[PDB]
Tab-separated table of N, CA and C in Angstrom:
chain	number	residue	atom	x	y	z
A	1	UNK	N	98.808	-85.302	193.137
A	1	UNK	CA	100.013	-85.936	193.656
A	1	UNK	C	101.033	-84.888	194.074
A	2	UNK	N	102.111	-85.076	194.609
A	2	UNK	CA	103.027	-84.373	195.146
A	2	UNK	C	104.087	-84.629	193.806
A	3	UNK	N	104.594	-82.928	193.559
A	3	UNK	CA	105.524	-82.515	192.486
A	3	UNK	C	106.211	-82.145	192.899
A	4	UNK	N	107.624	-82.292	192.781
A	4	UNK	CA	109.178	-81.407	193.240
A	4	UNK	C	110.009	-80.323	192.340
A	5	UNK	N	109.804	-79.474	192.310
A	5	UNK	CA	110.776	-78.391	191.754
A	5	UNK	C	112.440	-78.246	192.477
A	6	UNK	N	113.628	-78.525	191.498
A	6	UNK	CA	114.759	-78.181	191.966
A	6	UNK	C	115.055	-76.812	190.582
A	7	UNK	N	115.998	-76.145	192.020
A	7	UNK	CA	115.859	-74.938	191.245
A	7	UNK	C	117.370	-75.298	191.360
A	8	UNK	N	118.435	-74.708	190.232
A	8	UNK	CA	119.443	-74.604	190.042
A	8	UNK	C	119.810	-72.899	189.522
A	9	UNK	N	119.791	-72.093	190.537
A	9	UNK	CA	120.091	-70.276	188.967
A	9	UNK	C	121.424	-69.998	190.143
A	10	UNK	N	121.776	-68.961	189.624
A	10	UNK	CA	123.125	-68.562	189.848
A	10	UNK	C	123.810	-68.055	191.293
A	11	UNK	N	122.272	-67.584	192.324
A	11	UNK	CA	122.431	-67.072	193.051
A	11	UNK	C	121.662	-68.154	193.911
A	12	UNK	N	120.495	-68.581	193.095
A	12	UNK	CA	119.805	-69.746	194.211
A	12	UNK	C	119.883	-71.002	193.881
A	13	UNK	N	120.098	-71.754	194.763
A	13	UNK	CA	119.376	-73.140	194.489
A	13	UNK	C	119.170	-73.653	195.650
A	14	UNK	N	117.743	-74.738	195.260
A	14	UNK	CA	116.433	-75.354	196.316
A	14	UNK	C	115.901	-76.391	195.695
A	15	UNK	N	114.846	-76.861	196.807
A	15	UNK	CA	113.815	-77.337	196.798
A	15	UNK	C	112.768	-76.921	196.875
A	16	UNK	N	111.184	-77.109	196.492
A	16	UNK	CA	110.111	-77.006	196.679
A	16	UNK	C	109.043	-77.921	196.228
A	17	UNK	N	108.171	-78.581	197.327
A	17	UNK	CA	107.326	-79.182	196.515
A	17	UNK	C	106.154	-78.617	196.649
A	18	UNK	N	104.720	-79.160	195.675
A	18	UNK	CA	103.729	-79.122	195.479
A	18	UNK	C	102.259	-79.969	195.569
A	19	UNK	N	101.208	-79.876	195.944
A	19	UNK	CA	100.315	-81.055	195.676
A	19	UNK	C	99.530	-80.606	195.017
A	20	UNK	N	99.304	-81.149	193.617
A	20	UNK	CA	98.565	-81.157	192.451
A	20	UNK	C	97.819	-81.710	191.874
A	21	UNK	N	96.639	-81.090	191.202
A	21	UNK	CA	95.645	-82.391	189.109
A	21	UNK	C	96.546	-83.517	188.624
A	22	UNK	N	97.332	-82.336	187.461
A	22	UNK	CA	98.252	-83.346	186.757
A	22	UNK	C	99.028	-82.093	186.655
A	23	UNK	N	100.510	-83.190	185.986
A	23	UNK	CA	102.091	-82.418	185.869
A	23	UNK	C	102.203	-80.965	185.167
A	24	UNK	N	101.609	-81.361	183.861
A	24	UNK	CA	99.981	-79.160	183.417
A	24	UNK	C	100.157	-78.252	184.599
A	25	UNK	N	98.979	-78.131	185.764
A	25	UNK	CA	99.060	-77.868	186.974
A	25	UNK	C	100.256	-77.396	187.516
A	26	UNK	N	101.035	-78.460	187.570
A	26	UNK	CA	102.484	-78.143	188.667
A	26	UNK	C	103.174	-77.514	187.733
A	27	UNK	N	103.476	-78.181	186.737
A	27	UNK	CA	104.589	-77.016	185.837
A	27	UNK	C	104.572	-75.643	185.272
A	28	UNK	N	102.973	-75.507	185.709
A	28	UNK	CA	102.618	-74.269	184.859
A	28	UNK	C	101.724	-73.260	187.154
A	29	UNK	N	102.407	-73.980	188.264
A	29	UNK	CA	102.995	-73.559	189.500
A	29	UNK	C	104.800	-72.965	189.680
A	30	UNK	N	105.291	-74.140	189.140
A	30	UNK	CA	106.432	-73.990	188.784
A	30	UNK	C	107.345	-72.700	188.135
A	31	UNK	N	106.780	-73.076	186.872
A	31	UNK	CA	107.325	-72.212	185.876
A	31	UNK	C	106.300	-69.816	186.725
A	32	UNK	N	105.413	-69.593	187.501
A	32	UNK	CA	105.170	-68.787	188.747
A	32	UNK	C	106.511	-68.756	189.768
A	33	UNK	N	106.889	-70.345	190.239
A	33	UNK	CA	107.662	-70.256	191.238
A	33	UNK	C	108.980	-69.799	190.866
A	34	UNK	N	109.627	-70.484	189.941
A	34	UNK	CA	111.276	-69.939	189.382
A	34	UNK	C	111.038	-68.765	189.009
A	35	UNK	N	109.710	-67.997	188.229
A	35	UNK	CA	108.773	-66.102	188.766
A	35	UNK	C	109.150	-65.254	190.170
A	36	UNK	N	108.718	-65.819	191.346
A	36	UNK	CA	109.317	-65.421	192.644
A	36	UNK	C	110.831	-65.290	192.634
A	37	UNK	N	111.502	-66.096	192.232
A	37	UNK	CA	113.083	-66.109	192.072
A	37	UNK	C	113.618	-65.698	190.733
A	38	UNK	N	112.801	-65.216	189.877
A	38	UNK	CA	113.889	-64.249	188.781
A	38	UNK	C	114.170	-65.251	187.585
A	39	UNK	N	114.153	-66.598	187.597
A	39	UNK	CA	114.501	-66.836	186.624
A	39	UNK	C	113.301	-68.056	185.637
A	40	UNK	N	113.414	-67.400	184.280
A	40	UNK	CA	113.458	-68.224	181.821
A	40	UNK	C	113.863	-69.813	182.521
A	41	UNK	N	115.011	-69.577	182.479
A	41	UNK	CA	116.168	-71.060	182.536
A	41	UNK	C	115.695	-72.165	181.600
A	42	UNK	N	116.323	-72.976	182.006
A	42	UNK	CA	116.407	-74.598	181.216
A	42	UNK	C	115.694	-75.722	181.758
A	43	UNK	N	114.179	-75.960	181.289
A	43	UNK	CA	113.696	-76.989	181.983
A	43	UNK	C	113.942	-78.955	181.749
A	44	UNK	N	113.152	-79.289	182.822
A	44	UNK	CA	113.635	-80.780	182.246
A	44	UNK	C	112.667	-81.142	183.354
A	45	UNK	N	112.075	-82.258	182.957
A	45	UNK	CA	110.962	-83.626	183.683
A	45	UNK	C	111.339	-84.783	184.141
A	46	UNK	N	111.509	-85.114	185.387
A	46	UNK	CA	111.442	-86.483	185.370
A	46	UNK	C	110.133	-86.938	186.005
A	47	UNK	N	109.585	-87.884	184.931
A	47	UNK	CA	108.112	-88.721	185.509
A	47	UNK	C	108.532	-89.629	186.298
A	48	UNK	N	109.542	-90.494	186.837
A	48	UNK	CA	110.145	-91.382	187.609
A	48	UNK	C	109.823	-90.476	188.807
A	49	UNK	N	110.160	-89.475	188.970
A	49	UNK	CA	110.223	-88.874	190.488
A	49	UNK	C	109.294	-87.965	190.794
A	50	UNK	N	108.429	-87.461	189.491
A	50	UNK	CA	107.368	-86.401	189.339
A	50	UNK	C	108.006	-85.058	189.635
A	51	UNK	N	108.831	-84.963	189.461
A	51	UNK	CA	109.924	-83.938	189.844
A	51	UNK	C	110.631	-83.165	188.447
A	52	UNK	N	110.515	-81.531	188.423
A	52	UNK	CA	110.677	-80.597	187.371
A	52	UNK	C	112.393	-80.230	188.093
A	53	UNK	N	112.919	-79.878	187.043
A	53	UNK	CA	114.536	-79.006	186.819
A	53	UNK	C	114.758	-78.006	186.241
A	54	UNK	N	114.874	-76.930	186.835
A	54	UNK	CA	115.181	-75.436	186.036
A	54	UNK	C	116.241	-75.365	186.373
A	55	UNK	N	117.267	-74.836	185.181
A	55	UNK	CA	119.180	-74.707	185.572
A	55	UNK	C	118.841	-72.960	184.571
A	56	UNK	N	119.327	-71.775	185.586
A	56	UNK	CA	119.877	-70.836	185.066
A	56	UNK	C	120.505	-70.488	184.056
């Protein structure tokens, strides 16, 4: 399925999505992608939207 990463860090914030297995898969794309951009941060899930939140 298609997964959404919003990135919230200090210098960036975006969008990006993904097409994935299961939410495993994308979050563990994800948690690589906020990798490209530098940032640990603060995650959060919503299964309503299939969509991940990292805040700086």
């Amino acid at each position: 399925d298609t997964y959404k990463l919003i990135l919230n860090g200090k210098t960036l914030k975006g969008e990006t999505t993904t097409e994935a297995x299961d939410a495993x898969t994308a979050e563990k794309v994800f948690k690589q992608y906020a990798x490209d951009n530098g940032v640990x941060g603060e995650w959060t899930y919503d299964d309503a939207t299939k969509t991940f939140t990292v805040t700086e």
